[PDB]
Subunit: 223 residues, 4 copies
């Protein structure tokens, strides 16, 4: 435990944290810049290397933290995130699709993990998630039922919006958000199915009512 | 109570319920695939056969439950649903409209009945319904008053959106959801009726205020 | 007080009320019908006379109520409404504009006055109005300030939406409701005024924040 | 305290305040008319003259208040506003941009300062601001992360909406307000990026959930 505690002193050290938070904010500022074609035609490679540096440093740091915690680590939501967020950043710039190449910017999310209050907020938000799964389940069931009916009621003449179980899923979500649901979807639809309003108005009521209730439940049970 | 009790311990059995819930999730998955033209051609008839089976099994099951409960059953909302939902699934594939054929997917709602907690949610939600009928009535009255005025104020030059008492009902509901209410309806309407904004702004106010007051009456009462 | 109390017995009588509520619902049903060109080409005049009858009866009834209450009447919000709602219905079908001819249907609103619970609801809703005048004032001030700035910043090149203090008032309200504020108004506007987003985003924040607060105040102060 | 106290009893006087509030509502009305080209031509110069007068009077008044308070004044938010608001009104009509010329109508905001209750409202509102900076920070971080990813995922083929870190910022805010988010942006985007819905639906979820959780944290804490 000499080398160990010698490390634990660095890892648990203040300098360490602040230093990582420093690279987060420094790297974060560099990715908004590496966004400019112009800037990349100047300080282009600079930013590229600096990004390679930061990631190395972050791998070292992720390793050091594994020593000091080991099993305790792979049971920490926050460390697990930082783990997978750096691994993605590790996948070679080439091969497969550029998703990984873009998901890379997900590292700036470590400024939520590497900073309390942010952790508190995020924790507080998520705390509610579990209490809504009963409703979130009821909803997804509802959506599935209707998406199926819409695919087989309008997918024929309106393939763009309902030709597929998934196309219907997307359209029904757009209707839920109320986004041009009438001018954009139901009016056109009615030019062929005069009673389509019988399918959609009720759908907008249930989904709305639930959403509203879902919130009134949270507010109400507390105070 | 010889044959009766034999029937009851089965109907009232754990196996029974779970077996019914299993057919729900199986038929449910099957109707999702039955949505695919490809699968329709590559695994169709079997799916068609499976559906007929499920419904048969459900009729047997619905009968067994009326034995074990009789008059108790017809007074249970949850069973009444399961009743009418399977009945709809009974009407022959042909004849009349295909809605009865598309309405069958409504059986997947038995998973709300056959599963507690789901029952609780749906119960919790509906519990509020009656506590809003006063407002829901006031609103519907409001809508009727305005739908009539708009039909006779704009239906002449704007048949599509207000030519009928019901077309006005639809448009006013769209205005309530605030969907394209200005670019879509009022701006165009004003190209002919410069003061039309005198009709719609107040309407959007009343309807909005009431909606909000409605939700505020709900959570406030809780704390 | 013999003839008087003899009247007061009729006016305060149950039969009376129910009888007026009967004509309300009967007349209300007739105005939704008198909405159909077809129906008016059949039972056309019938409905016309029946509407004349109802209004006469309502004038008698309004007179009888003045006797029984006198000064107490012109201090009753509900009676005052019924008063002005019938007077409008009294103005000759001809002369001036058809507004009066259409405002006529405002009488069906007497089913809110002529029925408790409806009265309660409406009373409960309005109860809050006075407590929001401080905010409603702040808002209108805000709107006036911005409507002025927008008229003089965009009315030049965008006269349809801001060429007038009032055109700007309408557009700013549409922006508040968030109705195609971006695609419809700001994007187009930015094709000429690159920083227009500096005027509108802040406007959407203030207006939104306030609206939200305005409600959180109500909810919160109670329980 | 000879000249000082003479100055104070005037500045601290009822007359003074009311006189200032009177000029606000007068100048306020005047700027509404100054909005009319007709009035501009039919009553213009007088209006122009009146405005110069008002501002002079307000400078005198702003000076008198710094005497009576001195260092106390510069530490008062309400007076600081009135200060900077009149200063802007001082910059010569010409030179630079006309914004300083349009920003003058911001003086009508002194009616929020010069009138209590208005001060209270604005104070009550702002009181909450600090109690949300944790979330407002988390959100802005979120927006930055996504604005960067979208600029490099769609800015190439969709310059208008995502070609710049800031164009993406604008579009993502529009998506947040849910304005044309589907018909307007995602549907079109999918014509090239079929999985783009994987980016936007989750974004609309996080942003929505947080917004709601935000308002729920506010009223709950109150009861």
């Amino acid at each position: 435990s000499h080398m160990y505690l010698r490390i634990t002193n660095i890892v648990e050290s203040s300098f360490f944290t602040k230093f990582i938070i420093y690279l987060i904010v420094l790297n974060g500022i560099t990715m908004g810049l590496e966004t400019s074609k112009t800037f990349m035609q100047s300080f282009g490679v600079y930013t590229t290397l600096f990004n390679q540096i930061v990631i190395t440093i972050f791998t070292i740091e992720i390793i050091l933290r594994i020593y000091v915690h080991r099993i305790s680590f792979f049971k920490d939501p926050w460390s697990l995130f930082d783990f997978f967020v750096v691994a993605i950043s590790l996948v070679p710039t080439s091969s497969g699709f550029e998703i990984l190449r873009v998901l890379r910017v997900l590292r700036l999310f470590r400024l939520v993990t590497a900073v309390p209050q942010m952790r508190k907020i995020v924790s507080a938000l998520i705390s509610v998630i579990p209490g809504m799964l009963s409703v979130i389940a009821l909803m997804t069931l509802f959506f599935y039922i209707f998406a199926i009916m819409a695919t087989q009621l309008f997918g024929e003449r309106f393939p763009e919006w309902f030709g597929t179980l998934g196309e219907s899923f997307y359209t029904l979500f757009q209707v839920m958000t109320l986004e041009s649901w009438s001018m954009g979807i139901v009016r056109p639809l009615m030019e062929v199915y005069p009673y389509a309003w019988v399918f959609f108005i009720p759908f907008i009521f249930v989904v709305t009512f639930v959403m509203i209730n879902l919130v009134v439940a949270i507010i109400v049970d507390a105070c």
